[PDB]
Structure 1
Amino acid sequence: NMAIIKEFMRFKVHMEGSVNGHEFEIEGEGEGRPYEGTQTAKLKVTKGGPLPFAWDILSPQFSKAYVKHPADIPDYLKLSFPEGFKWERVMNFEDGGVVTVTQDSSLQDGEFIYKVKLRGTNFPSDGPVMQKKTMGWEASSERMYPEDGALKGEIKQRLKLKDGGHYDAEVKTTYKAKKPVQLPGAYNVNIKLDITSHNEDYTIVEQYERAEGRHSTGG
């Protein structure tokens, strides 16, 4: 798959979502280096803008083909191409807010194509999401393991708050290749997602992510 997943790859993304009943769409494009674990995404709100909630709850939904893997950890999600893979995520935020996401990743005309559907519910009207009081994610460690013929990841993810401290989410995601390919054992992925630019109302956003798999065992 090194022939089809090139060392530089572009993607296109579309998200349809709603948060606390506010419906929206986002379109974006991205590019990165799948074997180096880096990528940038440029997003535009195309319907429902300006969004009345924190961009930060959407940012982790905008690309696991771009994780640097040691040669001895099977890169299951790269191996899934050209057919690709799907992922499904639940985020439980500490104040009862919930985000669920489903995503399809495919490869078409030499670029990744991402289709995302998102449902955010139960965010308190005076909480940091609906009041836009967040300031980006801390670096994360996603704990990966195979289960039931798919790859699972779990994160204790932390959003920085403008007035100090953190707003926490427990996250679980299943990543499932469309064809059986080799699953890895348990390992960790170190992720750092940064908003590198945005306009005043967050209808135009650029974000950078670095993600690298590391052994959890082996000394």
Structure 2
Amino acid sequence: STLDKIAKNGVIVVGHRDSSVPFSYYDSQHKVVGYSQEYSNAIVEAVKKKLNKPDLQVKLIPITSQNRIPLLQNGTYDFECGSTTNNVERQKQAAFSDTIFVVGTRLLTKKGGDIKDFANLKDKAVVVTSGTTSEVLLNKLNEEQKMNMRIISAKDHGDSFRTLESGRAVAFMMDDSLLAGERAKAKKPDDWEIVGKPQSQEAYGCMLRKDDPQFKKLMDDTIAQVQTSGEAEKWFDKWFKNPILVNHTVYITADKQKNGIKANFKIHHNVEDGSVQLADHYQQNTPIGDGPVLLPDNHYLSYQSVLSKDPNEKRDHMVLLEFVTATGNSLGSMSKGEELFTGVVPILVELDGDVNGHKFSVRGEGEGDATNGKLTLKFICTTGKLPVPWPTLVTTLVQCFARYPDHMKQHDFFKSAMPEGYVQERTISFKDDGTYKTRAEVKLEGDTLVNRIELKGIDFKEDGNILGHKLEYNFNNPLNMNFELSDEMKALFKEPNDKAL
């Protein structure tokens, strides 16, 4: 029995997925998260209570759609909660818990094309993940409907999507939620649409070994309680209505050696030829004054940025709208400076730059509303034509305006350093191109929040993406699933069941 194996070994081994978004997947920090993974954590805690082993160790191992049943049967892991369909054929090989979600198998395809339904796949190349129910359905469409599809089978859902994205398939067949999760990780999410009448409705269950009724009972009792108590719907909201923190994230950590914070993150700039220019950011902040500051636990700043133009503006310029929210990404006033940001605060930004000897200045003004995390700024190049693309300066051109929720205000270093302020320094390394070094002082001067920056760029290619002005005027934002919980799911959460559909 699995509970006997766990008790004897002092460990419970939890299988998990790499990229089943938003069910079980790695976030930007290589931590396993998602709606289904919440159940894994709850089941792990229920096992600790059942066995009265509060120090039980937890081992996470990655599985695929293809290897999940062999690795379960040979004891490599003990259970998994992810995106595995409960059906009668698989019940010959494994057991399933109460259902945790229901999906429909559809198609992801590029907009502007001719794939509107499954009938349009005739004679075409279609990608699917090896070892899935969709792979079976595609082969059945070939055998029974003479569709003559060339079926490309990829190792995991991210590999499947990237096959579609690169043009090597006309469509990706998969569970519709998983398709939306892969689209959210795309270079250009808005290029992709989910189409087609669903070929099946499928229930996700947590998978465990068969003929182990006592472990299945613990699992079902735990799931049914989470569902009937409302916690499952809270998990749905958490993982289906909040930014997916995989791409375009900002992860803040404490830099205690310097009484401040640091961050290491990646900005992806779209190139006008369809490629992506990586801008690797390393950031360090340290207080200007000697007063006490707040040193945070690890957390994210989730940025939503919109770049626009002012129609009545003849100078080279950028209008920037941003919403910035601090968040954790976990399963399952605090400074005097905080008080200085309860209203709307005028902002002044001054940047003096030199990229490959090309000297330029930027002046910005606007306001910050940290209660809502909202920034409105307009920047002008006061020296003429800006010699680099505006999107490359967005991150350089006031994290004190992030919205820290009530339960996280003890982690707001940026406001705690105010009014005396902080130094913000970055290296921005453009892949296959030059590097920005930036140094800013951010401080309250009277009632104005001032961001004064020096920027030094070196080693840029004069015909490259930056000095050659080949970057699109836009910005990548972390997306959310933007799904609502269906009536069918709410009825299931009221009356949990483990039935294949």
Query: Partners of 2:414 and 2:388 in 1: how far apart?
Result: 31
Q: 1:126 to 1:61 in 2, by over 3 A?
A: same
User: 3-state DSSP class of the match of 1:4?
Assistant: helix
- 2:440 alignment partner in structure 1: 103
- 2:463 alignment partner in structure 1: 126
Structure-2-length-normalised TM-score: 0.27
Give 1:11 deviation, angstroms.
Answer: 0.9
Aligned positions of 1:179-194 closer than 5 A? none
Query: Partners of 1:14 and 1:92 in 2: how far apart?
Result: 22
Superposed CA deviations along residues 116-169 of structure 1, whole A, max 9, x for unmatched, are 00011212122111111112331269xxxxxxxxxxxxxxxxxxxxxxxxxxxx
Query: Partners of 2:434 and 2:475 in 1: how far apart?
Result: 16
Structure (1 or 2) with the larger CA radius of gyration: 2
How much identity, in percent, do the aligned residues show? Answer: 28
Query: Partners of 2:354 and 2:390 in 1: how far apart?
Result: 13
Residue 482 (structure 2) pairs with residue 137 (structure 1): no
RMSD over equivalenced CA pairs, Å: 2.0
Query: Partners of 1:113 and 1:21 in 2: how far apart?
Result: 26
Of 101, 109, 112, the residue aligned with 2:449 is 112
User: 3-state DSSP class of the match of 2:385?
Assistant: coil
The runs of at least 4 consecutive aligned structure 1 residues that moved more than 3 Å come to none
User: 3-state DSSP class of the match of 1:39?
Assistant: strand
Query: Partners of 2:431 and 2:360 in 1: how far apart?
Result: 24
1 or 2, which has the higher strand percentage? 1
- 2:235 alignment partner in structure 1: none
- 2:346 alignment partner in structure 1: 10
Q: 1:140 to 1:93 in 2, by over 3 A?
A: farther
Structure-1-length-normalised TM-score: 0.60
- 2:371 alignment partner in structure 1: 35
- 1:65 alignment partner in structure 2: 400
User: 3-state DSSP class of the match of 2:400?
Assistant: helix
Contact 1:99 1:121 in 2 (8 A): yes
- 1:208 alignment partner in structure 2: none
Query: Partners of 1:17 and 1:131 in 2: how far apart?
Result: 17
Query: Partners of 1:52 and 1:77 in 2: how far apart?
Result: 31
- 2:419 alignment partner in structure 1: 82
- Runs of at least 5 residues in structure 2 that lack an aligned partner in the other structure: 1-336, 480-501
Query: Partners of 1:41 and 1:80 in 2: how far apart?
Result: 22
Q: 1:140 to 1:100 in 2, by over 3 A?
A: farther
Give 1:2 deviation, angstroms.
Answer: 4.1
Amino acid at match of 1:9: V
Query: Partners of 1:133 and 1:96 in 2: how far apart?
Result: 13
Query: Partners of 2:413 and 2:371 in 1: how far apart?
Result: 13
Give 1:109 deviation, angstroms.
Answer: 1.7
- 1:217 alignment partner in structure 2: none
- Runs of at least 5 residues in structure 1 that lack an aligned partner in the other structure: 142-219
Query: Partners of 2:422 and 2:388 in 1: how far apart?
Result: 29
Contact 2:360 2:387 in 1 (8 A): no
Residue 392 (structure 2) pairs with residue 54 (structure 1): no
Q: 1:96 to 1:140 in 2, by over 3 A?
A: farther
Contact 1:41 1:62 in 2 (8 A): no
1 or 2, which has the higher helix percentage? 2
